[PDB]
Coordinates of C-alpha atoms and ligand atoms in Angstrom, one line a residue:
X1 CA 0.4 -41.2 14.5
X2 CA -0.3 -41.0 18.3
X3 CA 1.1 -37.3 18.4
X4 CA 0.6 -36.4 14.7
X5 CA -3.1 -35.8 15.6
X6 CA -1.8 -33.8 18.9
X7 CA 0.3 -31.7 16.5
X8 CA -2.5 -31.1 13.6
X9 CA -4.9 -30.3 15.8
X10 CA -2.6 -27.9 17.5
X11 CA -2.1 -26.1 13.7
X12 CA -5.8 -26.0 13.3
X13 CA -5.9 -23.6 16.2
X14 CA -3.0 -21.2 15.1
X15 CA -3.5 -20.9 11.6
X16 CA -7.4 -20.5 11.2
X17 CA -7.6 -16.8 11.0
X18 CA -5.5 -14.8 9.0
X19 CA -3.9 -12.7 12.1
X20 CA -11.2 -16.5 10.7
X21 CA -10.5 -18.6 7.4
X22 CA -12.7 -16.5 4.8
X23 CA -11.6 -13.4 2.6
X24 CA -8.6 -15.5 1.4
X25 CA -8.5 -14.9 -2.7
X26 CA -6.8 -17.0 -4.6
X27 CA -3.4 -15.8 -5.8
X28 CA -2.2 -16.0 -9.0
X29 CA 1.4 -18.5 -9.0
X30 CA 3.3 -18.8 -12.3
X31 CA 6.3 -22.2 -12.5
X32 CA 9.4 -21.8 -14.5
X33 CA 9.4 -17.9 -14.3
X34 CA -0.4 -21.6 -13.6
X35 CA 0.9 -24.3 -10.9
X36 CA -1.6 -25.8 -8.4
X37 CA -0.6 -26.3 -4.9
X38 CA -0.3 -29.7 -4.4
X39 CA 1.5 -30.4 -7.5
X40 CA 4.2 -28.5 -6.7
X41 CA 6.7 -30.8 -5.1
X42 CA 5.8 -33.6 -7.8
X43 CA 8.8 -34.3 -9.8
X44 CA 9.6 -33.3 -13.5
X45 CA 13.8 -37.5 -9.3
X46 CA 11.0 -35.7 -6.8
X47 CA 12.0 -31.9 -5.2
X48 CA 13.3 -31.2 -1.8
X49 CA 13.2 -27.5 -2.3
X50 CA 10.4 -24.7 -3.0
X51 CA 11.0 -20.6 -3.0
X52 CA 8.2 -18.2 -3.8
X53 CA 9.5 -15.3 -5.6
X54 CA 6.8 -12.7 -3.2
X55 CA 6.4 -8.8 -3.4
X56 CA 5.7 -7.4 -0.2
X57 CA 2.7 -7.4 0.4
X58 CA 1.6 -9.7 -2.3
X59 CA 0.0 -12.5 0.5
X60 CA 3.1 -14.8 0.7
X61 CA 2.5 -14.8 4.5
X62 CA -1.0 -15.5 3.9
X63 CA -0.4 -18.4 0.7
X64 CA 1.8 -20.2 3.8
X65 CA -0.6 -20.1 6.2
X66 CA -3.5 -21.2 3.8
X67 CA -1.5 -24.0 3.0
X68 CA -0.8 -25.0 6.5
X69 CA -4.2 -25.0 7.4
X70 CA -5.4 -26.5 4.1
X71 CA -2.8 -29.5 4.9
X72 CA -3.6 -29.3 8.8
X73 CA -7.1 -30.0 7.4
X74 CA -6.2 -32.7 5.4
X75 CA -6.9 -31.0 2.3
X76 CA -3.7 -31.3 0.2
X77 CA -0.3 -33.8 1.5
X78 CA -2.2 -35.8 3.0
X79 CA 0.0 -38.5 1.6
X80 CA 3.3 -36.9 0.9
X81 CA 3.7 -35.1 4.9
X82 CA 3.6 -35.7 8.1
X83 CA 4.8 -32.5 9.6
X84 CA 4.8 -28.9 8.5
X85 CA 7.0 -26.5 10.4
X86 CA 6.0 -22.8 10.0
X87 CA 9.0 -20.4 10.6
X88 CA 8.5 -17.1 11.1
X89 CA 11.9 -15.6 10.1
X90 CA 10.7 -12.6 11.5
X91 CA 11.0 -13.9 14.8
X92 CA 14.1 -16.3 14.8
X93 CA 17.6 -14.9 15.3
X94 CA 20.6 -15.0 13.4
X95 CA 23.3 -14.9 16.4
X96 CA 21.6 -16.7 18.8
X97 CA 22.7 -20.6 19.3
X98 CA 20.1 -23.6 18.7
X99 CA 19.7 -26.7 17.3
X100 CA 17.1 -27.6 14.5
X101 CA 15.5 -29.6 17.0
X102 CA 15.5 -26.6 19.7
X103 CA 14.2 -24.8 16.3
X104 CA 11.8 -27.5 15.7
X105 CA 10.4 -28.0 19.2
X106 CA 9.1 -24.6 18.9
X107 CA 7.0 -24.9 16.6
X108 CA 5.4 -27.8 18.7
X109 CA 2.5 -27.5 21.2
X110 CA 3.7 -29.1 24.3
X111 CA 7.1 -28.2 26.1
X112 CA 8.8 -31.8 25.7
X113 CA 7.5 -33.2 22.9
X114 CA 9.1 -36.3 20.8
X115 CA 11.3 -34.6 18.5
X116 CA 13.4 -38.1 18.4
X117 CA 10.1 -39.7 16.5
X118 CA 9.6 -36.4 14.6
X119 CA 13.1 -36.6 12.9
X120 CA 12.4 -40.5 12.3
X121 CA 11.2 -39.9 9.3
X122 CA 12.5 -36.5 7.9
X123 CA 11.2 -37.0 3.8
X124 CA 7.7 -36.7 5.5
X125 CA 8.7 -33.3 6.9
X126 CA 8.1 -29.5 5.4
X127 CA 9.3 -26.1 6.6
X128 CA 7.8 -23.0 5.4
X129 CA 10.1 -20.9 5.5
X130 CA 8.5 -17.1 5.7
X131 CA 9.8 -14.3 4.9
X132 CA 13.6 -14.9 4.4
X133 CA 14.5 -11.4 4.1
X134 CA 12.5 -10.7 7.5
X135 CA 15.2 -12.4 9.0
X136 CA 17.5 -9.3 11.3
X137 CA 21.3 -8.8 10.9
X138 CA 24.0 -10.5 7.9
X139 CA 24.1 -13.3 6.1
X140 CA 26.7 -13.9 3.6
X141 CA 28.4 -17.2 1.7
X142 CA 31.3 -16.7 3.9
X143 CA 29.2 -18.4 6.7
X144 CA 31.1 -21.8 7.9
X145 CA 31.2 -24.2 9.1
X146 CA 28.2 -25.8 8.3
X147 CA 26.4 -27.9 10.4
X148 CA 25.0 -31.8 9.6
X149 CA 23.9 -32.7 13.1
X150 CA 19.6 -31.6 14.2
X151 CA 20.6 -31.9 17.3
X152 CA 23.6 -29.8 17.7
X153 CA 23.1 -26.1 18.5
X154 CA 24.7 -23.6 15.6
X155 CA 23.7 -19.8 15.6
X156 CA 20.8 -19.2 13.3
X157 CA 22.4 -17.9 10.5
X158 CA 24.5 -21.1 10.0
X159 CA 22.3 -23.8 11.4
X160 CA 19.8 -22.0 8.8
X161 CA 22.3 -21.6 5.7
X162 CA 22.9 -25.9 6.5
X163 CA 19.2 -26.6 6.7
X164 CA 18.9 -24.8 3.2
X165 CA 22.0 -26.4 1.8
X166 CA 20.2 -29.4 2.6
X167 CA 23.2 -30.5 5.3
X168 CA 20.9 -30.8 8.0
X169 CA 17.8 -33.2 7.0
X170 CA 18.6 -33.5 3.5
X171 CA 15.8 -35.1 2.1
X172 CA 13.2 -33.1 4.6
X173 CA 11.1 -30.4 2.2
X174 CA 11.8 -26.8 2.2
X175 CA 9.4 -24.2 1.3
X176 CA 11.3 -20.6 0.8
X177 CA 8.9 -17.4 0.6
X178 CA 11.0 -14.2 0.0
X179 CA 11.1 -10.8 -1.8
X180 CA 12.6 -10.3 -5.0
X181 CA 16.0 -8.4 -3.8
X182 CA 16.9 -10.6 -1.1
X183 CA 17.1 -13.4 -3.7
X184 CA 20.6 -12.6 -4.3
X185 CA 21.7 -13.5 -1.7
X186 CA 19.9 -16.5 -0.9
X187 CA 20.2 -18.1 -4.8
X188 CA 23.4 -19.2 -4.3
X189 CA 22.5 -21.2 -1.3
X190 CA 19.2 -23.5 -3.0
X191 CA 19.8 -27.0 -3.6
X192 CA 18.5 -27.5 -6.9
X193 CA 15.6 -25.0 -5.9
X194 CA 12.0 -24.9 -7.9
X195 CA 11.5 -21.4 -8.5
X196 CA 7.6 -19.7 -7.9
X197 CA 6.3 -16.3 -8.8
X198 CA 3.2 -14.8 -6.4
X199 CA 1.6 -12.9 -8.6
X200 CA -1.4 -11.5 -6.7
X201 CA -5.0 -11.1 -8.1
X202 CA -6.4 -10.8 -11.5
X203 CA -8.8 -8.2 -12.6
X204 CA -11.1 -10.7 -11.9
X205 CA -9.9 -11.7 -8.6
X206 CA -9.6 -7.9 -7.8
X207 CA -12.9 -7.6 -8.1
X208 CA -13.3 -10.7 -5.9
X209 CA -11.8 -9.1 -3.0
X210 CA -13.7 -6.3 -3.0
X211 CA -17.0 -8.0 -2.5
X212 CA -15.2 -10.2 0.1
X213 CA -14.8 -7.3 2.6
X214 CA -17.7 -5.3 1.8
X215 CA -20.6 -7.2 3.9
X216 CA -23.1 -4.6 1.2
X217 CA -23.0 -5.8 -2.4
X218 CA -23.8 -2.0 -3.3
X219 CA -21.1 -0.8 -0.7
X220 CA -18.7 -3.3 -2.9
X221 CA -20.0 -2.4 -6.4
X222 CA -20.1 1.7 -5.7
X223 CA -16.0 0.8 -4.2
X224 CA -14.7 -1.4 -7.3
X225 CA -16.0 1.4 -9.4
X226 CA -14.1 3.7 -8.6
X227 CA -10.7 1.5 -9.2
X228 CA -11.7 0.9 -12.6
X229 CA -12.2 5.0 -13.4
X230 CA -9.2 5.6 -11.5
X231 CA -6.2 4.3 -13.4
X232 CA -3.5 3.9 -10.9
X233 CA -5.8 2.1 -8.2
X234 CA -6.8 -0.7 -11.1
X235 CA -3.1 -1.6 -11.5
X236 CA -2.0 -1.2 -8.0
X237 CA -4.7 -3.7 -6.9
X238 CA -3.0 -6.8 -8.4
X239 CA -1.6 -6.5 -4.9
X240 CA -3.7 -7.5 -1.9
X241 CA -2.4 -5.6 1.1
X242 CA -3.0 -2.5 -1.7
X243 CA -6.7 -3.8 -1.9
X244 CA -6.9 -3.9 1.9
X245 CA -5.1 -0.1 2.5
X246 CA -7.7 0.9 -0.2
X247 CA -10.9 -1.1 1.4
X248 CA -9.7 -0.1 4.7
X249 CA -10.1 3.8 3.6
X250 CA -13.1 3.4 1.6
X251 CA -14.8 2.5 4.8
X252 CA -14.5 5.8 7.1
X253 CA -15.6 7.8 4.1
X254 CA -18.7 4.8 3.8
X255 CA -18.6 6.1 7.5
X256 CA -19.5 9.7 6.7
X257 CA -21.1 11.3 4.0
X258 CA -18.5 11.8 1.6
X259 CA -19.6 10.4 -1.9
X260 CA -16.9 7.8 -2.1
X261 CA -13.5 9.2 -4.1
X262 CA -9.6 8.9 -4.1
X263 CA -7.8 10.2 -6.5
X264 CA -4.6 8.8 -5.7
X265 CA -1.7 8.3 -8.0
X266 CA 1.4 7.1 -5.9
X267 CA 1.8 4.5 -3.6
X268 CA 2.9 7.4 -1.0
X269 CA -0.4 9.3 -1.4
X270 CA -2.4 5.9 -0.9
X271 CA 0.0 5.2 2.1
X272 CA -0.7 8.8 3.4
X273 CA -4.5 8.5 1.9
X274 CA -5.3 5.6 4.2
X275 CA -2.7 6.4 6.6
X276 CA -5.5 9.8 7.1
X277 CA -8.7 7.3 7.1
X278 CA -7.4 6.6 10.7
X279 CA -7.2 10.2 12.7
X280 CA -0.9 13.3 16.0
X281 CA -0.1 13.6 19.7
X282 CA 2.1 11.0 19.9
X283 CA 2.8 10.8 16.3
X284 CA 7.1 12.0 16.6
X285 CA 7.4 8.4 18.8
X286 CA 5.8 6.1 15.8
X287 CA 8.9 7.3 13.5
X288 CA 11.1 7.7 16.4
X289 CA 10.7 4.0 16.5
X290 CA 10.4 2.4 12.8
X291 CA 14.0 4.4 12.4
X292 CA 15.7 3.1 15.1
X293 CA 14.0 -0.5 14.1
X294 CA 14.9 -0.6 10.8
X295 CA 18.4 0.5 11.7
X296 CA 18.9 -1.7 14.9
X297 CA 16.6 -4.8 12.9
X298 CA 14.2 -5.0 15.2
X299 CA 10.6 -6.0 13.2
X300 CA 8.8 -6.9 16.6
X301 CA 8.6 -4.4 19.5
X302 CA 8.2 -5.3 23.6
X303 CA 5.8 -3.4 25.8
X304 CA 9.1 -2.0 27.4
X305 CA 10.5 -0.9 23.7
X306 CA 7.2 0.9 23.5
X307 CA 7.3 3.3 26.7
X308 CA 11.0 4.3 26.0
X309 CA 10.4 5.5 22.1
X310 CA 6.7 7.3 23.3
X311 CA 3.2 6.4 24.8
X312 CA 4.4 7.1 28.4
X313 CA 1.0 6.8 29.4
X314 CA -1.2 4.0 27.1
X315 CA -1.3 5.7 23.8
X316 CA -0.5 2.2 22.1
X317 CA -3.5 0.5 23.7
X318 CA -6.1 2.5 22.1
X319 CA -4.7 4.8 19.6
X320 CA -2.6 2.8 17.2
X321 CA -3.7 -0.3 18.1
X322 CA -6.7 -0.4 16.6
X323 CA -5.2 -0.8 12.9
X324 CA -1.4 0.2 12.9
X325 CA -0.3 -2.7 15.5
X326 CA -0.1 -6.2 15.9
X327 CA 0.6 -8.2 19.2
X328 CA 2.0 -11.4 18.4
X329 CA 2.7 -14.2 21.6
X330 CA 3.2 -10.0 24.8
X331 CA 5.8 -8.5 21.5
X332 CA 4.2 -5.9 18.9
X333 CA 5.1 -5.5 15.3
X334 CA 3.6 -2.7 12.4
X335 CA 0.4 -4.3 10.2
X336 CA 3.1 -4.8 7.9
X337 CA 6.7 -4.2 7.4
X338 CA 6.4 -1.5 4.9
X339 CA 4.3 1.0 6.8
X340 CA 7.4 0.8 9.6
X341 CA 10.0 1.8 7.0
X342 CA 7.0 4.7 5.9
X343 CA 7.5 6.3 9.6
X344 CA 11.4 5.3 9.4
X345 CA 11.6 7.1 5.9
X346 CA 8.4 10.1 7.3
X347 CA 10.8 10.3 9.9
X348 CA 13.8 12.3 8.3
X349 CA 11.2 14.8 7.4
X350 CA 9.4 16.3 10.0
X351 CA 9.0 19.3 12.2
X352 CA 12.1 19.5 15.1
X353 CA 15.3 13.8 11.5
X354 CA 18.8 12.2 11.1
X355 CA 21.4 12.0 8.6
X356 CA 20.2 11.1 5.0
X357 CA 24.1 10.8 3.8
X358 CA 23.9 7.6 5.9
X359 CA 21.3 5.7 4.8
X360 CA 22.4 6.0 1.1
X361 CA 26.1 5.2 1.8
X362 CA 24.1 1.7 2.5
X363 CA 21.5 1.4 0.1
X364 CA 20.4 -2.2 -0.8
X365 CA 22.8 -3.8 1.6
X366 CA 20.9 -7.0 3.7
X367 CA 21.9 -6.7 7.0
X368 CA 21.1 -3.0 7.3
X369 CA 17.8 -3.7 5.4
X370 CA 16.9 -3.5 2.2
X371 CA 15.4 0.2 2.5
X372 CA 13.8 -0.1 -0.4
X373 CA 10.7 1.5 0.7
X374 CA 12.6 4.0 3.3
X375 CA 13.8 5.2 0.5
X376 CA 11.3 5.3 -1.6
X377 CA 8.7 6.7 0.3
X378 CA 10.5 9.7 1.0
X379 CA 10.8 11.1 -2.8
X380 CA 6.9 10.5 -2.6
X381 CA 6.9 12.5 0.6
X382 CA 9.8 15.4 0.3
X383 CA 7.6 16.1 -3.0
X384 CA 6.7 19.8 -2.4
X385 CA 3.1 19.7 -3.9
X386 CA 2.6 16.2 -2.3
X387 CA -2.3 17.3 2.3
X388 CA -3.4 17.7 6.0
X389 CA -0.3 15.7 7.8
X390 CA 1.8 18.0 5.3
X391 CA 1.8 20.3 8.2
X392 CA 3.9 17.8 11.2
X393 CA 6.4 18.3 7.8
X394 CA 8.9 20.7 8.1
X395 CA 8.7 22.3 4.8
X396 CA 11.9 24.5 5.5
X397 CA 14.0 20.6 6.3
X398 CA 12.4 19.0 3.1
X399 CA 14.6 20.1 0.4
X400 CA 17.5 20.2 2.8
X401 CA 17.0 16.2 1.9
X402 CA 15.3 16.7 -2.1
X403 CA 18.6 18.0 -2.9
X404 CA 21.3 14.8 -2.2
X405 CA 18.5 12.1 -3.4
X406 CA 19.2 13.9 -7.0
X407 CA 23.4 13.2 -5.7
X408 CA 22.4 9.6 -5.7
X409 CA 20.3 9.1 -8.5
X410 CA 23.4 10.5 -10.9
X411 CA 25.9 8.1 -9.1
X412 CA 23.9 5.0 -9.7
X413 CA 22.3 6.4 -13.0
X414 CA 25.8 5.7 -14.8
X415 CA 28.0 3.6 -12.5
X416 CA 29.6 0.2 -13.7
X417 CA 26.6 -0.4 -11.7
X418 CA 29.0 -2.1 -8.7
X419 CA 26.0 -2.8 -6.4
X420 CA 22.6 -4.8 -7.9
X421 CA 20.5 -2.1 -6.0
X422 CA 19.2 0.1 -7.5
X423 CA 18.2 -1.8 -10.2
X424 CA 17.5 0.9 -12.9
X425 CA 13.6 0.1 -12.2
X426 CA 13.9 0.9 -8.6
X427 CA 14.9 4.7 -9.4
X428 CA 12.2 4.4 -11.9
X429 CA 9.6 3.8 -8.9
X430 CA 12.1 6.5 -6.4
X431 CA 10.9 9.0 -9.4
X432 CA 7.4 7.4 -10.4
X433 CA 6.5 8.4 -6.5
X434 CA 8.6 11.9 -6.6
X435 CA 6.3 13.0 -9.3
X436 CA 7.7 16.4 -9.5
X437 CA 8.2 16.8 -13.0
X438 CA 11.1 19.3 -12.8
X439 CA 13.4 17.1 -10.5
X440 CA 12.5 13.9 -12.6
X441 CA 13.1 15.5 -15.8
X442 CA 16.6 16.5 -14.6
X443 CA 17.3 13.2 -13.3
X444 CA 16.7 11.4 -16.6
X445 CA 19.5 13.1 -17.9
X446 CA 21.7 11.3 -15.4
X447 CA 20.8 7.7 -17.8
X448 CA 22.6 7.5 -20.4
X449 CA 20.9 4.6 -21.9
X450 CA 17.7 3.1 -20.3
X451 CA 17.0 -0.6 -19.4
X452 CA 13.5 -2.2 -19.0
X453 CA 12.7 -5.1 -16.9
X454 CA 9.0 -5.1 -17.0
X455 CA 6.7 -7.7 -15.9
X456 CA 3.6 -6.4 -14.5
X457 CA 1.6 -3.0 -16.1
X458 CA 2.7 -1.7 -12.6
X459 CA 5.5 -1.7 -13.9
X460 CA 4.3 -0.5 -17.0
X461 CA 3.1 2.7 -15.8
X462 CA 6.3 3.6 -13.8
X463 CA 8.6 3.4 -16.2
X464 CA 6.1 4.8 -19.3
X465 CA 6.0 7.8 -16.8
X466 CA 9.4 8.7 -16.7
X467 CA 10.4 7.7 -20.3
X468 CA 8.8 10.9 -22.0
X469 CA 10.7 13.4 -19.1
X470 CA 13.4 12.2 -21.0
X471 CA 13.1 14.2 -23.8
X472 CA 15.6 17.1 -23.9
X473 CA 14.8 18.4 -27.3
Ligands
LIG501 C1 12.4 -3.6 -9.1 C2 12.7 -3.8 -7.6 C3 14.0 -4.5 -7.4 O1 12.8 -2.5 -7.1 C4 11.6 -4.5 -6.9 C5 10.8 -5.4 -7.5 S1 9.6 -6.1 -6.4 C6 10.3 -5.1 -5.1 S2 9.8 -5.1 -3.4 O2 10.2 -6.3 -2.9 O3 10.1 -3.9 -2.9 N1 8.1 -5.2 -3.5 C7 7.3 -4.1 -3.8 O4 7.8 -3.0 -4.0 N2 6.0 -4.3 -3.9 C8 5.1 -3.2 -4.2 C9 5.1 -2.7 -5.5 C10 5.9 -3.3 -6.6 C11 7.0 -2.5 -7.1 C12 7.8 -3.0 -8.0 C13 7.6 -4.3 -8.5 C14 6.5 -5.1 -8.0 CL1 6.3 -6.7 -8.7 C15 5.7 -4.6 -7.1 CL2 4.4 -5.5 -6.4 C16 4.2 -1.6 -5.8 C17 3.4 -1.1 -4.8 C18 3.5 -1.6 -3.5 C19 4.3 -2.7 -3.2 C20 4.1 -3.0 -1.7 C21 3.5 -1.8 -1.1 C22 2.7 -1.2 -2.3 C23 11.3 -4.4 -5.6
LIG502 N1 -4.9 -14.2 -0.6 C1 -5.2 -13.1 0.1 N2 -6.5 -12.9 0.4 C2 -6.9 -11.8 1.1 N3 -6.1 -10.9 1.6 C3 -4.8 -11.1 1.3 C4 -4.3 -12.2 0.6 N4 -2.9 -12.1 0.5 C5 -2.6 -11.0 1.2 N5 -3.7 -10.4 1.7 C6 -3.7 -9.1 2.5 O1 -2.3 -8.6 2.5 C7 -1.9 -8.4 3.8 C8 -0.4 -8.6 3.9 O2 0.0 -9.9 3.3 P1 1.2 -10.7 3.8 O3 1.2 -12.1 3.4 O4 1.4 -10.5 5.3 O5 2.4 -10.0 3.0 P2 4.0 -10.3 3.0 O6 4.2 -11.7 3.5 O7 4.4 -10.2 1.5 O8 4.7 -9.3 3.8 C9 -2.8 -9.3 4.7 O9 -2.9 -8.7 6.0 C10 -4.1 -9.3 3.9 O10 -4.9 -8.2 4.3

């Protein structure tokens, strides 16, 4: 244990803020579709593998971190671990060569440390695994061949798909976070995997938040109030990074004098509500960037990406910074991956924009990314009655694109339903956020018969919207 104290210490320091260790709210988990923490890997014969089902957005990022500095502080495995490994999928390649140890010895502190005595022992070792659909570029079955040696150098995407077959290390522990789509692909992979939902807050817990960011217990009361009058915000803040969107834009407007309000009723017109809350100059170069990023897979941006895309002259370093970066090691990536695919999706619709006919010829596809949200976003946005930033739209270009999303819908309304995506729910939320009754209306005809897969009153709403449009007398 001469180093394992080197190493803890070393996690302390990383993982004591969430980007210190206060506003965390405890997230609801559900097993077998209310599990505590530690008894997760305790057997029903014990587990070697964990995957959180996580909605973006829901925390999963945070839940991982939480538990690394919960264990880091001795607070839960104590006994059962000697080592957690957090890997940012984000960051790690899927082309590049490396071993698990030249994986591993990243993770570490010091340059050279004793990965021979780390892998001594690997049923005392963890990786959290974050964000597996963060990871950039392919990944299929066809991947070979795979790899049963830590110290031999594969390229990522098969020295990972080994280390999740449980080739590599097999009786280490492997903690999966991901979103809900990209569990296609990685299902087939899971050795005998123990399946998690993240959940997000209760009503209670809602509230909970609320009064954890506002420093003022009447600033907090007067700013839950007006999420339980509005009917849209109530659901939609079972999500966190909702909550902080919401808290964040509810604190300009405590700024001024504007009697607190926001009548929102799609996630685009929270987006763009909040999105507001912060302000233009150098606003074609944010777009210019999430588009080619999504596209090219790049999640975290250089200094030198920066100045080619826009801010020639330090528009990053005070302008967007502020709240619409992070800087991670000297790289930058978006507050959250979602708000890039809102500029890559905002930026097919503004004032002189690509080829739409593209990105649809590749929906739900995982090397391409998901676009879940590029698309979308931009029903929500192309919507002709859906504000001030309306004007950098190009209202004549709009319904160039409304037109061809309405192409799409009909193809995958009544398909043999080839691809997963869209999942008839998804078009539900593409017309939920293109509230346009007219266009949604016309859409519904498309279905010949519907299908419901509803598990939150998100959910709920969404679909309940769209099912009386159906109607056609
Ligand atoms: C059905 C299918 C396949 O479209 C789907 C299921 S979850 C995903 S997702 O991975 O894209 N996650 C989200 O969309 N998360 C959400 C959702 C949301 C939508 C639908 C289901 C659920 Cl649970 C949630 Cl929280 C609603 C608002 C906001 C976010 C993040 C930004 C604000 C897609
Ligand atoms: N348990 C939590 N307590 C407080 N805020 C949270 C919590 N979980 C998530 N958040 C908020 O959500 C944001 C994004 O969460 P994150 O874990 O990065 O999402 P994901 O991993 O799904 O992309 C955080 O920056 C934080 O503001």
């Amino acid at each position: 244990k001469d180093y394992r104290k080197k190493y803890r210490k070393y996690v302390r320091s990383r993982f004591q803020c969430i980007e210190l260790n206060k506003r965390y709210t405890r997230l609801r988990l559900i097993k077998e579709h209310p599990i505590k923490m530690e008894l997760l890997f305790d057997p029903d014969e014990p587990v070697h593998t964990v995957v959180f089902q996580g909605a973006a957005g829901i925390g999963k990022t945070i839940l991982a971190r939480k538990m690394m500095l919960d264990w880091a502080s001795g607070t839960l495995y104590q006994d059962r671990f000697d080592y957690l490994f957090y890997i940012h999928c984000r960051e790690v390649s899927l082309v590049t060569q490396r071993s698990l140890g030249d994986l591993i010895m990243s993770c570490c502190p010091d340059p050279n440390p004793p990965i021979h005595k780390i892998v001594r022992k690997p049923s005392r070792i963890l990786f959290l695994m974050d964000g597996f659909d963060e990871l950039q570029g392919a990944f299929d079955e066809h991947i070979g061949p795979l790899c049963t040696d830590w110290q031999k150098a594969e390229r990522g995407d098969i020295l990972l798909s080994s280390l999740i077959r449980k080739k590599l290390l097999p009786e280490a522990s492997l903690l999966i976070t991901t979103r809900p789509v990209a569990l296609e692909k990685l299902q087939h992979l899971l050795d005998h995997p123990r399946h998690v939902e993240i959940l997000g807050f209760s009503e209670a817990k809602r509230k909970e938040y609320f009064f954890k960011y506002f420093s003022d217990e009447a600033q907090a009361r007067a700013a839950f109030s007006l999420i339980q009058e509005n009917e849209v915000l109530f659901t939609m803040c079972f999500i966190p990074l909702v909550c902080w969107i919401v808290c964040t834009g509810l604190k300009q407007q405590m700024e001024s004098g504007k009697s607190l309000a926001q009548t929102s009723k799609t996630t685009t017109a929270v987006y763009v509500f909040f999105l507001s809350s912060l302000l233009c100059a150098h606003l074609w170069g944010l777009c210019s960037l999430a588009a080619d990023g999504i596209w090219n897979q790049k999640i975290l941006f250089e200094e030198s990406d920066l100045r080619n895309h826009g801010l020639q002259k330090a528009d990053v370093s005070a302008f967007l910074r502020m709240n619409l970066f992070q800087k991670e090691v000297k790289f930058y990536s978006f507050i959250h991956m979602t708000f890039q695919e809102f500029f890559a999706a905002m930026y097919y619709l503004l004032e002189e924009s690509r080829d739409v006919t593209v990105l649809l010829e590749n929906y739900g596809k995982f090397e391409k990314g998901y676009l879940i949200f590029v698309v979308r976003f931009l029903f929500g946005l192309v919507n002709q009655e859906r504000s001030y930033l309306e004007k950098k739209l190009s209202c004549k270009i709009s319904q160039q694109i409304r037109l061809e999303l309405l192409k799409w819908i009909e193809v995958k309304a009544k398909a043999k339903k080839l691809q997963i995506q869209p999942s008839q729910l998804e078009l539900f939320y593409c017309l939920y956020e293109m509230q346009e009754e007219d266009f949604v209306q016309r859409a519904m005809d498309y279905f010949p018969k519907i299908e419901i897969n509803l598990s939150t009153r998100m959910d709920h709403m969404v679909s309940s919207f769209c099912i009386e449009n159906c109607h056609r007398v």
